[PDB]
Design a protein around this ligand. Structure first.
Ligand code: NA
Lengths: 225, 230, 226
């Protein structure tokens, strides 16, 4: 048998699927896993034949968060002010979009990976929630769904089911159990068929405007050409 | 019809895009007329609230693609009016969009520039310029995330998908949904309600709610407090 | 006009002016500011609940007190007109709304981290009708809380929002049966007080601090939690 890969990459034309695959650890992200995720997305960003990525977990779950059991071992999550975030790709500003395909649980650092993605496609039976946040949760959640609901989720740490996630704008799509990956890959293929430069420029302006005045944001938008 | 018509009823001014063959697409002259209409509104102390709407059962299909490369083409410059006309203006008084049929691409951007959106039950909104490969350069990428949050904004912006009135209302994009053919009337009723309120105070509150975007809590609170001077 | 009740690590701050329907005048605002100063500084208090007695929350600033010694204090420095509305507390506050939370009263509810609302409660910018400006953070906080579109609706029109609509738009975080807002908020406060405190508080402060900041600067600040 071959050695275990905690992150598998599959490509189908211009769509790259990045898969967390740690059955025993319920897709928890340790140091080597985070490094592999960061490398997978670095490779995606630089590859001009890849248009859209999908981030998913195997084994019927997305990601249980940072690998607690690895704390104090050589496999521990790397926590530094510089370089990659503890979960891996969570500080990256990619030039192209990523869709999260969520089955089972997307919790703690796992939720943060989902917030980092552009869109979230969620199974009807999936659960999201906070359950410190140092992979962008406190930054992204209020921007994504508004301060009021963000502060609810952040303070309480409560579970959010798919119906509520959809109602509040956290889940962009809700699909039947087991279908998140397929549905996200199709949506990624649909996006890959659109005029790319224009879509990518519009995405980057919608990201860049956060924290800017109307005047400055409009200026940056106009550079789309 | 001239491409933009202006009708007034006391302190409510209705600005009407009226280009039947072009489905109310906005070309260069049309954009210039919209900019002038709103300049005149902003400066007129007898006008309190404006309504932006489209004739012919639709709102605005976006920038006039067919006019590209002609004398009537949209004017695209870093300075001055935006391509769609009024899309860069910071008016001192509010504007209500009254949407029938389509408000798509640059037409959606005009609707996002308005303070409020009143939408017919059958109306359709969306970033249809996604499919044509024309960029959002009249504020859509700036205003949509602020209006309805980053998550839903990025959905609409990336996919370019159609949003019907029920979904627009559910996500906060449509502020009111009314029966087909009633958007203009309902917007004009709402505009008249707003015109009856104490004006200075409402206008100061509106300007602070706009200005706070991109500011820290402290700086935004400071700006807000200056409303006491108004 | 302000009563403070404590139950372990949960402090309840109560506006209590029956004749004035819990309107906040100068002395009341000063008492609210002091209550929250004391809460912030008290290491044995984890979570606060802000609520009103007499079946209502707060009708706003006390208009009838204008021009009297009891008038709201309106200054660019120091406490806001409503009292605690400019404070950046180190710990969370839950609003427990019965009856009306309108005008400055709505602004106090927006200043809180969460809002628990009775099924028959009413919220709105009723100062629109009176011509009194929002100067206790409403224009700042409402668009952040629920998005610009719905904020501008409520701000321009001054219309009433019932509990169901408040819940649908993300203004009310919980809706409970009439008469239960205070109890439900105190339960929720106790739940929060049982969680690991340093972590919850740091996450809260980062989610507040990021407003107005670029992604990069906000991420930098967040990382200082660890
Ligand atoms: Na800023």
């Amino acid at each position: 048998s071959m050695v275990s890969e905690p992150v598998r990459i599959e490509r189908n034309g211009p769509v790259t699927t990045v898969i967390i695959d740690r059955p025993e650890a319920r897709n928890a992200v340790n140091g080597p896993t985070a490094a592999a995720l960061f490398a997978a997305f670095e490779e995606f960003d630089a590859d001009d034949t890849a248009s859209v990525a999908v981030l998913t977990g195997a084994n019927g779950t997305f990601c249980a968060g940072a690998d607690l059991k690895a704390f104090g071992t050589p496999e521990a999550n790397q926590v530094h002010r510089e370089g990659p975030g503890p979960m891996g790709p969570s500080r990256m500003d990619l030039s192209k979009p990523v869709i999260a395909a969520i089955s089972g649980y997307a919790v703690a650092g796992g939720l943060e990976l989902a917030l980092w993605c552009d869109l979230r496609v969620v199974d009807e039976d999936a659960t999201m929630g906070v359950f410190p946040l140092i992979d962008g949760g406190t930054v992204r959640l209020p921007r994504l769904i508004g301060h009021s609901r963000a502060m609810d989720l952040i303070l309480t740490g409560r579970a959010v089911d798919a119906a509520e996630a959809y109602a509040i704008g956290l889940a962009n799509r809700v699909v039947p159990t087991g279908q998140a990956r397929q549905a996200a890959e199709e949506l990624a293929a649909d996006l890959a068929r659109l005029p790319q430069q224009c879509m990518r420029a519009d995405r980057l302006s919608a990201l860049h405007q956060w924290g800017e005045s109307e005047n400055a944001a409009m200026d940056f938008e106009f550079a789309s050409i």
